[PDB]
Structure 1
Amino acid sequence: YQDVNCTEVPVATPTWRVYSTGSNVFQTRAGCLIGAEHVNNSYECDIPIGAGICASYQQSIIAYTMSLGAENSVAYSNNS
């Protein structure tokens, strides 16, 4: 749901009342998403959301901040 302080989601049928309220609610800049699990670690960007969140499927659906690649520092010295 886009641009909503997510506490207002239940206001606006047979099976739709499992994706309203519910158990997992994540609040992001784009809005709030229901049905996903926040994860601390990061991976490559699957299906994108916005403001740096890329949801994906792993057995459930996760929503994580995006990764930009693997760190790599070059051993630099003035005579090598």
Structure 2
Amino acid sequence: RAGCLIGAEYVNNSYECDIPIGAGICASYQTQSIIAYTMSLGAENSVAYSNNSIAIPTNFTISVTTEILPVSMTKTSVDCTMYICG
């Protein structure tokens, strides 16, 4: 739906997106050749719901993760007379 794609083989598997083509179609370099596929949203899972069943953990894990935020940027100054007239 994004157009005509030439030079890539369309496969029937699904992977995580590498190069977004569009409309749910991504491309990747694998096997070696260039392939096009439909991206996968995630792994399938089902939860065992019932009238009277509960799940309770017996152990734990301590996890440390990182987050990166920009705070400032470069301070620039321009001289009109030298830029325009030299």
TM-score normalized by the length of structure 2: 0.59
Note the 1:31-42 alignment, pairs <5 A: 31-42=3-14
Note the 1:23-62 alignment, pairs <5 A: 29-58=1-30, 59-62=32-35
Give the CA RMSD over aligned residues.
0.5
SS at match of 1:56: strand
In structure 2, which of residues 31, 37, 45 is the aligned counterpart of residue 64 of structure 1? 37
> What are the superposed Cα offsets for residues 32-79 of structure 1, whole Å, 9 maximum, x if unpaired?
111100000101011101100010010000000111000000011110
> What are the superposed Cα offsets for residues 9-41 of structure 1, whole Å, 9 maximum, x if unpaired?
xxxxxxxxxxxxxxxxxxxx1111111000001
Q: How many residues align?
A: 52
Runs of 4+ aligned structure 1 residues displaced above 2 Å come to none
Higher strand share: 2
Q: Percent identity?
A: 98
